[PDB]
Subunit: 142 residues, 4 copies
């Protein structure tokens, strides 16, 4: 139950935008490999930046709802659903202003009480469908 509660605190940060206490539950060595192309590198600051990015992209009304959280050893798996609105540029695609919802799975390793390894799997295909199958502009993503 300790580990489930740590992951619920991470979920809560995405829902409130609250990053002042991330050093209490994000490991110094935190890395989410998806964040690198944004410039977002390691530790509590990287996680704070990721929260910021999610809210900037999918709006201050984004909601991550919990379906269920599982654990095995030091690993925690969170089955969530994201509810958002496409209000920020996303992989080179201007904001469609379209609402969407999609299931997501997160996998996290807890190391000495804090989240150190974090992978997430959005329902990218369903999000793109709900956004009307957007395209990047000439600027693109790189």
């Amino acid at each position: 139950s300790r580990q489930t509660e740590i992951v619920r605190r991470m979920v809560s940060a995405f829902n409130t935008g609250r990053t002042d206490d991330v050093d209490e539950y994000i490991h110094p060595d935190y890395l989410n490999p998806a964040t690198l192309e944004h410039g977002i590198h390691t530790g509590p600051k990287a996680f704070a930046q990721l929260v910021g990015w999610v809210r900037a992209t999918f709006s201050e009304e984004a909601r991550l709802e919990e379906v269920r959280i599982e654990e095995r050893g030091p690993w925690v798996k969170a089955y969530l659903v994201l509810y958002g609105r496409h209000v920020g540029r996303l992989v080179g695609m201007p904001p469609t202003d379209r609402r969407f919802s999609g299931e997501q799975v997160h996998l996290m390793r807890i190391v000495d009480g804090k989240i150190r390894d974090h992978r997430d799997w959005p329902d990218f295909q369903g999000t793109l469908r709900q956004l009307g199958d957007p395209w990047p502009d000439d600027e693109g993503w790189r």
Copy 2:
């Protein structure tokens, strides 16, 4: 565009619960083959009953959002997303009170200005996941 607007009127009925005017856009011969196991048979009354059932099952806050509507001949295809809350018994499963969202596709044939043939394809599997993989009780569905 006429046919797209008829289907938008159907979508709107699910969003408002408004069934007083269904005879203006639902064909006398309307049939949705999924409705039969509820007792819901043909024409405008069957469609009214279906609206009622959707709102009773997925709540008076259910929302059907439009992604896109396509047509070919007398056929219209609606790409929607349902947002709801499981507040009514569903295929023998007591209400979980869980929020969910899922894409849905509807296919309708327009006959003399009114919806006559109607099939819908919910994201049943994703809904069930978001409801925590519920089970029917001893009463079941039949």
Copy 3:
């Protein structure tokens, strides 16, 4: 484990087309509510007809693979994946001859050793995408 094995026998019938022994594991009162619009009514014969329809529609190479089977009381839930090819008319849509695969969930009630209540939830939306978003012809489905 008895009930899991009964459902595996049902899965096997779809994979082999073998219907000579359906009276041994399909209840006299069997009903799948989806089958009614094809004319397919109750008991072992209805189930045999459904096997036939699946193979006629999604080809003699259709394969239903097992992910996992769960039970609770008299209920069994089968998480499967269908692999097929669209070789028969489907809801008024001529055969695209396209290969597809989609997860499916089946829910069955076992009554005195035999399958009596059967609901299935195909990934209809994903199947339709993989078939290139087909349309019904003028004949339609009714």
Copy 4:
């Protein structure tokens, strides 16, 4: 049609494992941001390494089937379906030896006749379900 054919050549490489000619259709500056955590960096060699990784992970029988390919300007969008078998370690998860299939969307920018920007969106959640919801081992992914 030129750009569609370039993307079909990329699809074909995943299906045959053929990487001797990647410099003819992969830009010197090619980057897929997902590949970085494997060590796989830029250009034709990075793409060759990615083909290798896909076949090592999802087997020499992996098949990427084409649903449809769209283009807009220099951008190409490929709607595919992957058929594979989990035979290599995947994000810290030992091979389950389970077959799976999942839709995938790829987005590519063509620059002077060659693929330069490449993002892919697997159906990760559906793959994980079909693999029986595997877990990483103690070694993990990092």
